[PDB]
């Protein structure tokens, strides 16, 4: 049971802020406050501020110049961390810790920020090949893994998941692609579409078969 727990949804390749802040007001001394941003599972040190001059280099090469706090923000009580170039490889829980020297080196703030990274898939491409009946659907560059649905545009219902063939790919750049091959018996005027849902973004994209 921490002082605060938070989830942060962040886009790949963007700047994100993980908030560790008090109700702002000029009431913190840099020469007094000790701040530690550290990964929660691996316990490695992402960044930190102490009043004495620090050797640095303690930060592994992973976060060295991509994670930063604001000194003016610290003086206002804003110890938030700023990551600069998010990758699906940063999807982990973080932990912020604040101690005071005026106080008994006591914890003024301790928060856990679970960081969920996501990227939006491309608009699906649907093909209409045939057999004695076959549909293929393609989307790329999304995160995390996608769910795919085939929608009957006539009554806005969803076709059964057993009728579709799903295959998930992990490309370079660490994103996800998907191919879904749907097989259904012939009927007059197939009006259907391929829906691809990014669960974390709560976003679905859909294209119909003309």
């Amino acid at each position, epitope marked *: 049971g921490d002082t605060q727990e938070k989830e942060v949804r962040a886009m790949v390749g963007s700047d994100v802020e993980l908030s560790c802040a008090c109700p702002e007001g000029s009431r913190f001394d840099l020469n007094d406050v*000790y701040v*530690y941003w*550290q990964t929660s599972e691996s*316990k490695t*040190v992402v960044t930190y501020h102490i009043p004495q001059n620090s050797s640095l280099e*303690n930060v592994d090469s992973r976060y060295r110049n991509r994670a930063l706090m604001s000194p003016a923000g610290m003086l206002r009580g804003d110890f938030s961390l700023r990551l600069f170039n998010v990758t699906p490889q940063d999807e982990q829980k973080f*932990h912020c*810790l604040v101690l005071s020297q005026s106080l008994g*080196f*006591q914890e003024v703030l301790s928060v856990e920020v679970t960081l969920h990274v996501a990227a939006n898939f491309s608009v699906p491409v649907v093909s209409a090949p045939h057999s004695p009946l076959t549909f293929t659907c393609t989307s790329i560059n999304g995160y995390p893994r996608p769910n795919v649905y085939w929608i009957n545009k006539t009554d806005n219902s969803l076709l059964d998941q057993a009728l579709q063939n799903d295959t998930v790919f992990l490309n370079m750049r660490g994103l996800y692609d998907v191919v879904s091959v749907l097989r259904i018996a012939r009927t007059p005027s197939v009006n259907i579409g391929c829906c691809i849902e990014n669960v974390l973004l709560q976003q679905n994209l859909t294209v119909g078969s003309q």
Partner: antibody
Amino acid sequence: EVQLVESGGGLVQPGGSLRLSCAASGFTFSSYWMSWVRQAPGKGLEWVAYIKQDGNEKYYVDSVKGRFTISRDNAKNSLYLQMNSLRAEDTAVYYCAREGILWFGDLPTFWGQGTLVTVSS
Amino acid sequence: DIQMTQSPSSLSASVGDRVTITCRASQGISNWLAWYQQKPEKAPKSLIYAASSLQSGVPSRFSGSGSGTDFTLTISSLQPEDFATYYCQQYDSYPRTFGQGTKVEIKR
């Protein structure tokens, strides 16, 4: 406020075993270094052992290596010192302590109250 | 792995006198030294941290000093309550190591 409560001390025969528990409260246990220091009656303060946040890196005293083991449970906020094959030289008061966070110690050591262990026939 | 040499190991000073204790480290420490005071059958009490900064609740007559290898704990005006054993501990690197301790008797 910061509180470190030792337990599990007392009297054990030579060659016996004893496990010391340290219940922590008042700070994020998982984020600090943990340590056991001891003091023999009338003798100075001698550090026993240190453990890092995750628990991979551990440091022991030559007098202790191969016989004691530090463990830590951040889920339950507790630190443990397991002693096996105790000798009379190990009779002392044992303090549980909270150390720094960084690789190069930064925070002053915060001391428990001590529990005392007597190894005697 | 770091060695602390504390001097003297014992001393006697009359009340109101000035007392000085030195602590030398095997290798360079950067103000990462604490000083503790211990009364018999009690746990050690933190007097000073970061070379010369007093902890909350320490009389101002206690003074810290030093940088690099050489450190000093100074009692300005000794008082009949100052009889104790004083230790220096480095927390520059783990394992943190202590000095042998300085016992202080009061001259009367």
